[PDB]
Amino acid sequence: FRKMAFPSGKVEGCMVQVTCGTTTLNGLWLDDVVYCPRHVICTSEDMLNPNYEDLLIRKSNHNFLVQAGNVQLRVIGHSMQNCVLKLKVDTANPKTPKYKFVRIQPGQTFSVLACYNGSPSGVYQCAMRPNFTIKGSFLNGSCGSVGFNIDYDCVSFCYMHHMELPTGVHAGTDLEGNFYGPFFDRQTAQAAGTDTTITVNVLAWLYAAVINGDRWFLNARTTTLNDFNLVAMKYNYEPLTQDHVDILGPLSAQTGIAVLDMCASLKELLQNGMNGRTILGSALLEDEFTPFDVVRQCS
Amino acid sequence: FRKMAFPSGKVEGCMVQVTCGTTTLNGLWLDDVVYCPRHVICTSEDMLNPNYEDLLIRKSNHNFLVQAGNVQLRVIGHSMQNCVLKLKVDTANPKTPKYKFVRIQPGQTFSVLACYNGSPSGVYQCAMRPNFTIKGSFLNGSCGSVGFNIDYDCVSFCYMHHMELPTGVHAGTDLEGNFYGPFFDRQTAQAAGTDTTITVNVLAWLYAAVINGDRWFLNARTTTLNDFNLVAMKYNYEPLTQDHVDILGPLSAQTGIAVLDMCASLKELLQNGMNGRTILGSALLEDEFTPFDVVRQCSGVTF
Ligand SMILES: O=C(Cn1nnc2ccccc21)N(Cc1cccc(Cl)c1)c1ccc(-c2cnc[nH]2)cc1
Numbered sequence: 001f002r003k004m005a006f007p008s009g010k011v012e013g014c015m016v017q018v019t020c021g022t023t024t025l026n027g028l029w030l031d032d033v034v035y036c037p038r039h040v041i042c043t044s045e046d047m048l049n050p051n052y053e054d055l056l057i058r059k060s061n062h063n064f065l066v067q068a069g070n071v072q073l074r075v076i077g078h079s080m081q082n083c084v085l086k087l088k089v090d091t092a093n094p095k096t097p098k099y100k101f102v103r104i105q106p107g108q109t110f111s112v113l114a115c116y117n118g119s120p121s122g123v124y125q126c127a128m129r130p131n132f133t134i135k136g137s138f139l140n141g142s143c144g145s146v147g148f149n150i151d152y153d154c155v156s157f158c159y160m161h162h163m164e165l166p167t168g169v170h171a172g173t174d175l176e177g178n179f180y181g182p183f184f185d186r187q188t189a190q191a192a193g194t195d196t197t198i199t200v201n202v203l204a205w206l207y208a209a210v211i212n213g214d215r216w217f218l219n220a221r222t223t224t225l226n227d228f229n230l231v232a233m234k235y236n237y238e239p240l241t242q243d244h245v246d247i248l249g250p251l252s253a254q255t256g257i258a259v260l261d262m263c264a265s266l267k268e269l270l271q272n273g274m275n276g277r278t279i280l281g282s283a284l285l286e287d288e289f290t291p292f293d294v295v296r297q298c299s
Numbered sequence: 300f301r302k303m304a305f306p307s308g309k310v311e312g313c314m315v316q317v318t319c320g321t322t323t324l325n326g327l328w329l330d331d332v333v334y335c336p337r338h339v340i341c342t343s344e345d346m347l348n349p350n351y352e353d354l355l356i357r358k359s360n361h362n363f364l365v366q367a368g369n370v371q372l373r374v375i376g377h378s379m380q381n382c383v384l385k386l387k388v389d390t391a392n393p394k395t396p397k398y399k400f401v402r403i404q405p406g407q408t409f410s411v412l413a414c415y416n417g418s419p420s421g422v423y424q425c426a427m428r429p430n431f432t433i434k435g436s437f438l439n440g441s442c443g444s445v446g447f448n449i450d451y452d453c454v455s456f457c458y459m460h461h462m463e464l465p466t467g468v469h470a471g472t473d474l475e476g477n478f479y480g481p482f483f484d485r486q487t488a489q490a491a492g493t494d495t496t497i498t499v500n501v502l503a504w505l506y507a508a509v510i511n512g513d514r515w516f517l518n519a520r521t522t523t524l525n526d527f528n529l530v531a532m533k534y535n536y537e538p539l540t541q542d543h544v545d546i547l548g549p550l551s552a553q554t555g556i557a558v559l560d561m562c563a564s565l566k567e568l569l570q571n572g573m574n575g576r577t578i579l580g581s582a583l584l585e586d587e588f589t590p591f592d593v594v595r596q597c598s599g600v601t602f
């Protein structure tokens with residue numbers, strides 16, 4: 001049972017390099033529009049305290065240099081949507097997949113294609129944390145890298161990378177340019193809200209551990225939904241809803257372990273710890289697999 | 300510090316499905332040849348005790364269905380090379396990347412593009428265990444999925460999936476059809492030998508920890524490679540080769556920590572444990588990042 005990302009090919013065909021002055025980052029080229037973080041228009045001094053509408057009005061189309069591989073794309077128009085810059089180019093991307101822009105919920109997962117200078121480096125799976133940060137693998141130059149899910153040949157873009165917080169976690173926006181969380185695109189120190197653990201995901205992963213033959217953490221106790229939620233909140237776990245219980249249904253049916261019986265296992269795990277043991281190779285409780293991620297990989 | 304697969308687009312454009320009789324599996328289309336596991340020609344009952352040479356003699360080109368999506372590629376030649384079947388097709392793949400076939404060492408990592416009916420489903424990073432199994436994520440119908448590394452847009456293919464073992468680990472061949480490990484393509488009970496920890500990768504991970512400022516485990520001693528190898532084997536760790544010392548060279552130079560000093564620090568961790576401390580947030584020593592994986596993720600290496 002591994003962390004599994006979607007194949008990246010359809011997104012690879014869309015990655016380009018956007019340059020404004022001496023600032024360079026990645027852009028997403030779909031049809032005849034290139035999307036990228038708007039802080040590409042900032043000098044390093046601008047970034048310290050930018051007024052974006054003021055900075056953008058002073059830019060011309062020729063200030064923007066878009067490179068796809070070794071081809072230069074000509075910018076023929078530019079506008080700004082929230083924190084995203086939209087460059088109209090004179091060429092349509094022949095590799096544009098069927099796509100959608102979506103805003104994901106805390107606790108949902110997505111694949112990230114990490115890119116530098118418009119070229120792909122690696123792909124990995126991430127979750128939107130409850131505090132709206134992501135635990136990414138991004139170096140300097142990765143801004144504009146995107147997160148996505150793929151369903152029946154359609155790419156749903158959900159994340160564009162903008163920054164790294166002082167703690168090393170990452171923040172960004174949806175494809176409409178709205179940050180996830182209370183962050184802003186100004187280079188100043190920003191703390192995130194206190195993070196919590198994605199409970200429905202931990203339960204899914206515990207089910208994955210049972211499907212793969214590991215039952216050491218199970219027990220006989222039972223719990224009610226409310227009583228489990230009392231303990232969950234005490235340990236900074238997100239509440240479990242009745243829809244979460246229903247979503248876990250297929251995993252409950254496959255294993256013959258009622259959802260609330262798995263909650264009693266997790267409650268014992270939180271109150272007693274793991275006693276040096278491991279689950280699915282991990283010594284910590286993993287919360288970045290959703291029930292769907294488990295179902296897709298286990299079936 | 301998290302696992303990172305290679306971008307999979309160059310391999311996605313090479314995946315096809317191969318059907319013989321009622322058996323469908325994945326194939327790899329490069330130029331005008333499709334490579335796939337030879338057990339596609341077996342029935343499920345044949346698998347119990349196959350004679351591949353006899354099963355192949357009764358096959359003709361017109362018995363093989365190769366499809367790119369739903370589009371048939373006409374087979375115009377066939378042959379068997381070890382445990383892989385090579386089907387010559389009448390169309391050269393225009394998506395063929397620059398590529399090589401390589402045979403990897405235990406401990407080395409690769410990305411696997413898990414596929415079902417020729418359709419890519421997911422990508423993840425895998426290590427070849429010292430017992431020549433991989434702890435992959437494969438369901439039925441994933442046979443023929445390949446593992447690969449990328450180096451400046453040359454794809455090095457290193458693994459083709461053939462089978463699941465009773466313990467749930469996976470076994471396969473290189474692109475020339477030679478199994479990794481003492482396994483065979485017959486459904487007879489086979490078992491993986493006892494596994495060990497990949498020492499060179501644990502050392503790579505300790506170097507990654509030092510790079511990020513987590514260095515409480517650096518001790519004051521050194522060791523010789525021979526002395527270390529004899530001790531490590533008592534803890535079910537692999538011995539180091541001369542190639543292992545050399546591939547740790549760049550991390551040793553970047554951190555200023557001699558390889559044999561890091562071996563001495565690891566030895567102390569084995570003999571005394573962690574004392575409830577963590578490394579890179581982990582209470583366990585990670586052994587599925589190679590030295591190359593550490594550098595690839597710490598630099599912005601693109602392809
Ligand atoms: O963190 C990043 C960029 N970044 N992203 N991932 C990273 C991983 C490692 C290192 C840096 C990373 N920041 C800081 C920042 C702080 C608060 C808010 C924001 Cl939006 C950015 C940044 C973004 C733009 C510029 C820039 C634009 N023109 C000139 N200079 C300079 C710095």
Ligand SMILES: O=C(Cn1nnc2ccccc21)N(Cc1cccc(Cl)c1)c1ccc(-c2cnc[nH]2)cc1
Nearest residue numbers: 322338341342343437438439461462463484485486
């Ligand atoms: O394990 C697998 C295949 N497999 N691989 N990953 C898997 C993940 C989930 C489920 C199955 C998986 N085996 C059993 C086997 C035992 C020892 C050696 C070998 Cl080679 C195979 C197999 C291989 C071919 C056939 C077959 C050929 N024609 C028609 N049916 C039938 C069974």
